[PDB]
């Protein structure tokens, strides 16, 4: 069998606490800050856009093909932050997924019923004995059809919710007050006052301005529902409009 | 402590110290360094010579994967060989399915997901190695990319695992391999090996050498011997 | 009692087991017999059309 | 250990074996075994009567022990064969081992803590013990042998067999050149060894440990020499590996003949039990 | 500097220092618990005697069964503990009816010993969910015979390990009798002289008295297949102590 | 019970005793290890009792070549006859149904030479502790009743956290709070004996789970800086000179002996 | 300080290190010397047979495989019968499907795999039994040994077992002038390196060495007892 | 391999004109 | 001790693992059902506290069929899981029988596989307690389903965080007489008497179930409510 | 050569009761491996290890093989949470309505017999 | 589950995948019609499992 | 049938061996009639011809 429940109240997973709380699943999120990496999506009316950083330690490395920001379906885009090998294994799980539900329904899966059934499948780890959280949110983006822009977050709790504006990270809970003075604020955000108030969020939770080397931008828009990885010098280009004033 | 006995356990501050110690453990074996040049790219290792019983090939540690993609290895002989058995197994699948030849950031990305998901598990435990795959297309040029046991696959310019990959890597940075061949390349990975090489603790290695790229028709080959015996000449009077 | 003689009834999901006793009741079919009911044809003239803005 | 079924809690153990526990019949059944495991020192022929220690009633000058069955080999040869050796006895022990009442008609190729001194000289004592004795047992065994007013114009030595694997070096114990010796002795011994002292690390944990403590504390030179072996069982190299302990000053007025040794080395090797084959 | 508890001989499939599994060779350590053994095999025959060690007079003797017919020319020993020599012994009978049946031929003494064995080193592989033993037998065996290569003698312990032994005795006292067996063993052995020293170290490592009742032994040679000795032939054999 | 090393009593006459604990980790004698490795105390006596299961060292504090080949063993005890310290060092295991004779007879030497204090280092299972420990800091202390009216002041003006009081018999639910420390070997049981005894001894312990304990030692052997300022207090920020503690001669290779030449 | 990782197999020591399978190394040194030295034409494979019993034929070191594979163990005789099984079942399998004799060096490469297989997975333990693989196919003779760690060596001569760094010592002191050989003077050389791992006090008699030969022309032939007179005559004292 | 006659085929525990 | 296993009962025989997953239902967030002469109403506390929080996406109040429904207190994404598998019980029970399923069927089928998982080993209970709403032939019915597997039928009741204080508060305000237009009104008052925060628009959820089915309210409804 | 269960043969049927006897029976192992070839196929051979290291540890425990079982974990780990099939209405094994001896079908279910 | 309108292709797609499934034993012929968001549409599904989007 | 008999009577004095061996009694003949009939019973129809 299993090497056993390891005896102890945050030894194993399902074992309880005397006040009922899985611990195994409240390290998994403190395991999220690993890396230092934090991302941010926040959506107007009419665009959806995930920012993350792009930290290269390093010159050797090949920076095109160290990324964040991972396609699900053509209108379906999600960015990972946590330890990367789970991201990618829940990004594959994704895919799966996304396009098994093409495939028995007829029609592409709506972003909710995504996140809504990889949140399922994560939580189904919170429950055995050997199975472990992933150590990795995701955060969905994309238009349906009607529904609306829609940016979406899961956990490896096995919770989801909906958000006109959300972060993750390590710098998550200061980007989350930034943004929600942002939400308070003024919330047209067409495709400026959009992106621009990621960078910024970003930016001012993080450290002075990024340059366009470090910065990695998917965007989804109403008339044009297609997952776009920003190229390097349209990014440039919104960071000289943060500059040009 | 007394969060590491498993992969299934988080610690405290939320690192699973079971994948910690054997990213820690790939340190105990020796050196391997590869380079990716304008033609193809070039592996070679600190092959340790246990002792002078041993044949001239025993030990190896650059496995063919398949006719173009190659493998060089750091830690435990035993699941690096079993990880390059399977890695021939999903090229071979692969093939099969679909006619050409697996592309390398694909191949790379089916065994990275295989060695994670043995890093998720109270049962197996995960593997004990990194590798380098490595490989050369006219449609995509050359390619180079590295697993750590935690399953984390990136693409590499310059690469180097094993218990001195700092000083390999820091002597890799002196070169531009994106202008170079892989003629003029094998020689300063020779001189590279004899650098980064500790001698005072382990004499008598062997220099093992191997391409794949465009002079070799994109299939992987161990270097044919004469350029062998160039480099290691190179790297001595270098020394 | 439970009795002890099949492992279980498991699985259920479209019994054939059973079906080797409708291959050889020919009854209806040869020996005389031929009560041995047979099943149905119910749904003989189904149309439909697309309206302006919707189905009939 | 645990995990006997899917998901049962493991309960990692301690290393300090706090894992313990901290009612008639329980208190009963603890008395009758707790005395079943005694070690007894039997004046044999009277088979009793040694409430007094034994080297308590005996004047002593130079006590040779050897613990471990190699080491018994090594004393039964090299030493056991120049002079005569008389019974003064030996010691009972029922364990966790040596079971079935260990204690025989001494099964001549073999002995169990038996205890022998030499026939011009009574004072000088050699026990040879091959037998295991258990933690619970080594302090009541260190007092009937020696008592509490140990008269310290006498010395000890003994002996002991360690296998390589236990040896701890920043190289790996597939090098070292085993079998090697290596010599524990207290303050007051005053002479150097003829090999090396153990290093700091390493340990000694059994009754050679608790018979060098006891010599220890009482101001009693003593030595300690273990023959760090890579095979456990009887071997004839392991033993000639204590081949230098022959020439310290300890022993000298004892080695008279040593081809005599070497052939009943053989002798006693190829006459030797039966162990199971499975190659372990 | 410190010292620890270190417990390496608690889960099987668990190798000490020193590279031994320690649960295994526990198991060698149940054999010195059962009924003493002796087995000789001599050119002219083999013969198997073993003490009963009966508790009350109430039992029935030949209840007690610690000598076999494995098949006509093979029989056997038992030492420990029984109830796994009752499965082994199971195995032996079934391997070498099914060699038969196969091929028309009687199946020589070391290939049942083989396949007796093949039976054991099943110790721990409990993901083969089927029927495992999770653990070492707990019985030492003597296979005694007669084939081709005339008379054979062959000795398994807990650890699927067997070898053309001849005077191996097993049991409580089993080091003792082999003591004195080795200086008391000859190749020249008349089967009869075989049966009187064996008897006569059976008698030194008793309890009882020895007479029919506390001991049995059985005797194949190639004139006669498998042999027990009865109450008959044991006080015929024991008259002359 | 107490054996000297010169034939004669150092007559501790109110010297403060640091004792071990066999605990799991064993972070209680490591931590005492540090201790007596960094303030450099003389070896004065031995310990000798039938309780501990034998064993044979040399010097593990060894500083010097000259003294490297002083034989220890299993109890000896260490003493700073110039700043009233005096340690006992148990190295050991405890032999099977012993512990209540070394409690007492050890309790009857420390009565006998009339030493103040028995500070104790002890150490506890990380898997006793519910939830509230896991918020909190992993450090606790025990005062006997004597300790609970001397320094009583400082310990709650340091800002310590109390042992933990669970159900003496969870049988019942009208039983009183009363002291459960598993894992620390000899801990409650000098603790209750003490206060029968009524002999001043304080308890400073750690929830530990075994392993490299080399931080878990610091951290420990910091907790007794606290109180004790044996060690020159931090003053906020050497951050650089992280070895003010004397790592002891023995703190060589512990994971085991070396890597075989044939894996890697 | 390393009591809780070296219990069970699939647990890193926190110095990435599996004491499991170097402790199923240790097995391998509780076996018996044996020596596996080769020639341009042959493979031999010289062994010491186990006397730790006494009247009892010892045990049976050599073991047949195929007609042109032979091997020899050194460590639990549970997994060596174990292995020895699964070899021949290859070989068999190998000469059914494309009848051929299997490679030596695919079959060693077979049981790297099978043997690497139980090192990551919970409740099993390592194969605690050393090979030593003597075999001749289109590429002449071919001499791997096998660890317990699923690591398998191509070597010119190898000895494993108690005290078998002697053997290999001098092994490595004579391995220059093993490849150009007779039959009879690659046998002593072996017979050679298996004497110089005993004590001195006793020689390699006729009951306790088991050469067995495979090569060019000869199939592997395993000599037991009394027959191994005419290779063992000859050979010089020490 | 497609099928390839594994070994032996099936012969296992047998017990229990065109050919 | 004893704490660790859920198989392992104590000494005094109490399973101390179900005695946890009670702990974490009454760590979570307040719900209350109330069964009036007609109807039922089920209201919920929502913790989507900040702006970003979003209330089109995801629902505590949350149906199960075209008349039954359900709220929960403890954990989420087990929430979850239980409604995806009362919908396949639902579902099941229509098939076989061509008749709404019985709220009281639900209830037990429900409460068995929240069961479950209590006695297997190698798992974890459920940490939410169920409250689900019905109407079957002319009678409101309201269940409570422990984590244990235990089921209740209450005429009203409080769970989540602060449930004792609010089953008292329930007690000398309920009785026959009320019907659901005032059982709304009084599971609110229930409600903000520990609401911690002073409800808005959508700080709650709220559910009926009368003959016109399991309905959930939105949130113009329940801002009407909040006007009294 | 035995019997007390039915003489445990069925020699005589071999050959299936239908084209759709076998295949609609085992269609739950089919449809394992139609996603499986799948995924070795596209996604890797780490996705079919993961589907089955789970699949093995969602049965071991879910309560002994001579009662009912729902199979929660199971069945939100494959689509079959939200799709409901033929196999779920027909002769559920809640209603068994064949059973043995307790003991006797527990063991097999390791594999005792 | 959704909380949306369920789309008529799905129901298609369910339909043709049984019946396929199925290998056409279940001889069940349907005309499916609705109107989700995206306009009405008609299926007509075979037993064998094809199905056609005709206007009428 | 020649090779059907043959094989069955060879199986079935396997069978009556193995319970001599451990019962220690020769078999009745009413039960090894039994035994063979048990064990021809399966396969019925299948193509044995058995007349034994």
Not at chain 1, 132 to 148: A, K, N, S, T, V
Not at chain 4, 185 to 208: G, R, Y
Not at chain 5, 59 to 87: F, N, Q, R
Not at chain 6, 6 to 11: F, L, R, T, V
Request: glycine share 6%; charged share 25%; hydrophobic share 40%.
């Amino acid at each position: 069998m299993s090497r056993g429940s390891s005896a102890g109240f945050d030894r194993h997973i399902t074992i309880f606490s005397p006040e009922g709380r899985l611990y195994q699943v409240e390290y998994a999120f403190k395991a999220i800050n690993q890396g230092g990496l934090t991302s941010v999506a926040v959506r107007g009316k009419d665009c959806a856009v995930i920012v993350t950083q792009k930290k290269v330690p390093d010159k050797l490395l090949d920076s095109s093909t160290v990324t964040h920001l991972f396609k699900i379906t053509e209108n379906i885009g999600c960015v990972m932050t946590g330890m990367t090998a789970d991201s990618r294994s829940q990004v594959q799980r994704a895919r799966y997924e996304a396009a098994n539900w093409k495939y028995k329904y007829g029609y592409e899966i709506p972003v909710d019923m995504l996140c809504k059934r990889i949140a399922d499948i994560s939580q189904v780890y919170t429950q055995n004995a050997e199975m472990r959280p992933l150590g990795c949110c995701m955060i969905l983006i994309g238009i349906d059809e009607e529904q609306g822009p829609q940016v979406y977050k899961c956990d490896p709790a096995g919770y989801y919710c909906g958000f006109k504006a959300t972060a993750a990270g390590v710098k998550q809970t200061e980007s989350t007050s930034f943004l929600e003075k942002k939400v308070k604020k003024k919330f047209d955000w067409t495709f400026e006052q959009t992106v621009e108030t990621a960078i910024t969020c970003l930016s001012t939770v993080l450290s002075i301005d990024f340059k366009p080397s470090e910065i990695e931008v998917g965007v989804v828009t109403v008339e044009n529902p297609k997952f776009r990885i920003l190229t390097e010098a349209e990014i440039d280009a919104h960071l000289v409009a943060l500059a040009e004033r | 402590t007394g969060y590491d006995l498993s992969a299934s356990t988080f610690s405290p501050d939320g690192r699973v110290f079971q994948v910690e110690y054997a990213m820690k453990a790939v340190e105990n074996s020796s050196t391997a360094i590869g380079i990716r040049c304008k033609d193809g790219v070039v592996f070679g290792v600190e092959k340790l010579v246990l002792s002078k019983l041993y044949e001239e090939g025993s030990n190896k540690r650059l496995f063919n994967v398949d006719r173009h993609v190659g493998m060089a290895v750091a830690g435990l002989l035993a699941d690096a060989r079993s990880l390059a058995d399977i890695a021939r197994e999903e090229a071979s699948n692969f093939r099969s399915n679909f006619g050409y030849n697996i592309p390398l950031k694909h191949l790379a990305d089916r065994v990275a997901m295989y060695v994670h998901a043995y890093t998720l598990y109270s049962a197996v435990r995960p593997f004990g190695c990194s590798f380098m795959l490595g490989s050369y297309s006219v449609n995509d040029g050359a390619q180079l990319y590295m697993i750590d046991p935690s399953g984390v696959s990136y693409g590499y310019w310059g690469c180097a695992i094993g218990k001195a990959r700092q000083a390999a890597k820091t002597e890799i940075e002196k070169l531009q391999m994106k202008e170079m061949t892989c003629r003029d390349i094998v020689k300063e990975v020779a001189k590279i090996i004899y650098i980064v090489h500790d001698e005072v603790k382990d004499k008598a290695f062997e220099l093992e050498l191997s391409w794949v790229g465009e002079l070799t028709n994109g299939r992987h080959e161990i270097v044919p011997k004469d350029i062998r015996e160039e480099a290691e000449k190179y790297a001595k009077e270098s020394l | 009692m439970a009795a002890v003689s099949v492992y279980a009834p498991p699985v259920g999901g479209f019994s054939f087991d059973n079906c080797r006793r409708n291959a050889v009741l020919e009854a209806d079919f040869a020996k005389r017999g031929y009560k041995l009911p047979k099943v149905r044809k119910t749904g003989t003239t189904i149309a439909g059309v697309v309206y302006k803005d919707g189905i009939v | 250990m645990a995990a006997t079924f899917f998901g049962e809690v493991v309960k990692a153990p301690c290393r300090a074996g706090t894992e313990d526990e901290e009612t008639p019949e329980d208190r009963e059944v603890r008395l009758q075994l707790a005395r079943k495991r005694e070690v007894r020192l039997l004046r044999r022929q009277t088979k009793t009567s040694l409430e007094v220690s034994l080297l308590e009633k005996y004047p002593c000058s130079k006590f040779i022990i050897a613990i471990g069955n190699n080491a018994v080999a090594f004393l039964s040869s090299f030493v056991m064969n120049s002079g005569v050796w008389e019974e003064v006895g030996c010691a009972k022990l029922w364990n966790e081992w040596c079971r079935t009442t260990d204690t025989t008609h001494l099964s001549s190729t073999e002995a169990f803590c038996v205890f022998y001194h030499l026939k011009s000289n009574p004072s000088v004592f050699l026990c040879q013990c091959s037998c295991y004795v258990a933690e619970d047992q080594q302090y009541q065994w260190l007092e009937k042998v020696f008592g509490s007013c140990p008269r310290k114009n006498m010395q000890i030595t003994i002996l002991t067999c360690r296998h390589v694997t236990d040896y701890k070096t920043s190289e790996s114990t597939g090098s070292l050149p085993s079998p090697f010796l290596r010599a524990l002795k207290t303050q007051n011994f005053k002479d150097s060894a003829c090999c090396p002292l153990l290093e700091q690390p390493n340990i000694v944990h059994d009754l050679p440990a608790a018979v060098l403590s006891y010599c220890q504390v009482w101001k009693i030179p003593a030595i300690l020499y273990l023959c760090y072996t890579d095979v456990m069982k009887l071997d004839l190299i392991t033993v000639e590996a204590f081949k230098p302990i022959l020439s310290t000053r300890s022993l000298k007025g004892l080695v008279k003949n040593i081809p005599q040794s070497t052939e009943i080395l053989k002798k006693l090797m190829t006459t030797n039990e039966i162990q199971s084959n499975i190659y372990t | 500097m410190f010292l620890t508890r270190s417990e390496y001989d608690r889960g099987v499939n668990t190798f000490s220092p020193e590279g031994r599994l320690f649960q295994v060779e526990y198991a060698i350590e149940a054999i010195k618990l059962g009924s003493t053994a002796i087995g000789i095999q001599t050119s002219e025959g083999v013969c198997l005697a073993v003490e009963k060690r009966i508790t009350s007079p109430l039992m029935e003797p030949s209840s007690i069964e610690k000598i076999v017919e494995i098949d006509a020319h093979i029989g056997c020993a038992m030492s420990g503990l029984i109830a796994d020599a009752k499965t082994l012994i199971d195995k032996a009978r079934v391997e070498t009816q099914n060699h038969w049946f196969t091929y028309n031929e009687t199946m020589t003494v070391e290939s049942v010993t083989q396949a007796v064995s093949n039976l054991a080193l099943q110790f721990g592989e409990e993901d083969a969910d089927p029927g495992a033993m999770s653990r070492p037998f707990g019985v030492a065996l003597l296979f005694g015979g007669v084939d081709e290569k005339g008379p054979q003698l062959f000795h398994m312990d807990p650890s699927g390990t067997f070898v053309q032994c001849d005077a191996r005795a097993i049991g409580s006292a089993s080091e003792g009798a082999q003591s004195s067996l080795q200086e008391v063993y000859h190749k020249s052995m008349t089967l009869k002289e075989a049966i009187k020293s064996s008897l006569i170290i059976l008698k030194q490592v008793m309890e009882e008295k020895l007479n029919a009742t506390n001991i049995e032994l059985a005797t194949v040679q190639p004139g006669q297949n498998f042999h027990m000795f009865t109450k008959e032939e044991l006080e015929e054999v024991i008259k002359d102590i | 019970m107490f054996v000297p090393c010169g034939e004669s009593a150092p007559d501790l006459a109110g010297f403060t005793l640091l004792m071990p604990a066999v605990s799991v980790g064993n972070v209680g004698q490591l931590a005492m290890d540090l201790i007596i490795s960094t303030l450099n105390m003389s070896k004065i006596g031995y310990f000798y009792t039938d309780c501990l299961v034998p064993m044979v060292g040399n010097n593990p504090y060894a500083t010097t070549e000259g003294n490297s080949t002083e034989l220890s063993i299993n109890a000896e005890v260490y003493s700073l006859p110039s700043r009233k310290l005096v340690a006992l060092q148990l190295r050991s295991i405890f032999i099977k149904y012993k512990s209540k004779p070394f409690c007492e007879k050890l309790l009857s030497w420390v009565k006998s030479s009339g030493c103040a204090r028995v500070i104790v280092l002890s150490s506890s299972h990380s898997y006793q502790r519910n939830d509230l420990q896991l918020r909190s800091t992993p450090f606790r202390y025990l005062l006997t009743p004597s300790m609970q009216k001397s320094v009583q002041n400082k310990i709650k003006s340091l800002n310590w956290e109390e042992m933990e009081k669970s159900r003496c018999i969870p049988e019942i639910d009208d039983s009183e709070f009363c002291i459960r420390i598993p894992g620390g070997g000899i801990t409650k049981t000098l603790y209750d004996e003490s206060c029968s005894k009524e002999i001043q001894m304080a308890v400073l312990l750690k929830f530990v789970s075994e392993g490299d304990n080399i931080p878990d030692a610091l951290g420990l052997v910091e907790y007794l800086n606290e109180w004790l300022q044996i060690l020159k207090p931090l003053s906020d920020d050497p951050t650089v000179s992280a070895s003010r503690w004397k790592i002891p001669s023995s703190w060589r290779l512990l994971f085991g002996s070396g890597l075989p030449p044939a894996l890697f | 300080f390393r009591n809780q990782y070296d219990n069970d197999v699939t647990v890193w020591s926190p110095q990435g290190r599996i004491h499991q399978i170097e402790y199923a190394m240790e097995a391998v040194k509780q076996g018996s010397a044996t020596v596996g030295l080769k020639s341009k034409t042959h493979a031999v494979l010289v062994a010491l047979k186990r006397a730790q019993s006494e009247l009892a034929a010892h045990q049976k070191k050599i073991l047949h495989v195929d007609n042109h594979i032979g091997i020899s163990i050194a460590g639990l005789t549970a997994d060596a019968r174990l292995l020895c099984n699964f070899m021949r079942q290859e070989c068999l399998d190998s000469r059914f499907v494309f009848d051929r004799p299997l490679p030596v060096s695919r079959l060693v490469s077979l049981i790297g795999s099978k043997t690497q297989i139980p090192t990551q997975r919970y409740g099993r333990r390592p194969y605690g039994v050393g090979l030593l693989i003597a075999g001749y196919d289109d590429m002449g003779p071919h001499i791997f040994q096998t660890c317990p760690s699923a690591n398998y060596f191509d070597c010119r001569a190898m000895s494993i077992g108690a005290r078998s760094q002697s053997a290999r010592t001098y092994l490595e002191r004579h391995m220059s002038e093993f490849m150009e050989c007779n039959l009879n003077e690659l046998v002593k050389h072996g017979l050679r390196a298996l004497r110089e791992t005993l004590p001195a006090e006793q020689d390699l008699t006729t009951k306790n060495v088991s050469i067995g030969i495979v090569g060019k022309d000869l199939e592997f032939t395993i000599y037991d007892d009394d027959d191994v007179s005419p290779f063992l005559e000859g050979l010089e004292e020490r | 391999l497609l099928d390839l006659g594994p070994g032996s085929l099936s012969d296992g525990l047998s017990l229990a004109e065109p050919g | 001790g004893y704490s660790f296993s859920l198989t392992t009962f104590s000494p005094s025989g109490k399973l101390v693992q179900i005695e946890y997953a009670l702990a974490a239902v009454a760590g979570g967030a307040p719900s209350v059902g109330i069964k009036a002469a007609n109807g039922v109403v089920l209201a919920t506390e929502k913790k989507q506290k900040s702006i970003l929080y979003d209330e089109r996406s995801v629902h505590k109040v949350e149906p199960i069929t075209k008349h039954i429904g359900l709220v929960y207190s403890g954990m989420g994404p087990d929430y979850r899981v239980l409604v995806h598998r009362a919908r396949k019980l639902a579902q099941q029970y229509y098939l076989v029988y061509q008749e709404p399923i019985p709220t009281a069927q639900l209830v037990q089928r429900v409460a068995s596989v929240m069961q479950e998982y209590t006695q297997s080993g190698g798992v974890r209970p459920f940490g939410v307690s169920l409250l689900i709403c019905g109407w079957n032939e002319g009678r409101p019915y309201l269940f409570q389903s422990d984590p244990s597997g235990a089921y209740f039928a209450w005429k009203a009741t409080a769970m989540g965080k602060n449930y004792v204080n609010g089953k008292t508060f329930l007690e000398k305000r309920y009785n026959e007489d009320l019907e659901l237009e005032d059982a709304i009104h009084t599971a609110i008052l229930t409600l903000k008497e520990s609401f911690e925060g002073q409800m808005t628009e959508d700080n709650i959820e709220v559910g009926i179930c009368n003959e016109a089915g399991f309905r959930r309210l939105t949130p113009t409804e329940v801002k009407d409510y909040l006007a009294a | 050569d035995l019997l007390r269960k039915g003489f445990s043969c069925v020699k005589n049927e071999l050959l299936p009761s239908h084209p759709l006897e076998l295949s609609e029976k085992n269609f739950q192992l089919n449809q394992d491996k139609m996603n499986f070839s799948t995924l070795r196929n596209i996604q890797g051979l780490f996705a079919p290890l993961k589907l089955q290291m789970e699949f093995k540890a969602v049965q071991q425990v879910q309560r002994l093989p001579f009662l009912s079982s729902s199979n929660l974990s199971l069945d939100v780990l494959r689509g079959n949470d939200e799709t409901i099939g033929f196999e779920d209405i027909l002769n559920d094994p809640s209603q068994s309505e064949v059973m043995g001896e307790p003991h006797l079908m527990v063991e097999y279910k390791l594999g005792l017999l | 589950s959704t909380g949306r309108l369920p789309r008529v292709v799905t129901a298609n797609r369910m339909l043709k995948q049984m019946l396929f499934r199925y290998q056409g034993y279940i001889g069940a012929a349907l005309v499916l019609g609705g109107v989700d968001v995206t306009g009405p549409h008609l299926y007509s599904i075979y037993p064998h499992g094809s199905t056609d989007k005709l206007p009428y | 049938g020649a090779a059907d008999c043959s094989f069955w009577e060879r199986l079935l004095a396997r069978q009556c061996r193995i319970y001599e061996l451990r019962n220690k009694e020769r078999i009745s003949v009413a039960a090894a009639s039994k035994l063979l009939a048990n064990m021809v019973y399966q396969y019925k129809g299948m193509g044995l011809s058995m007349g034994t």
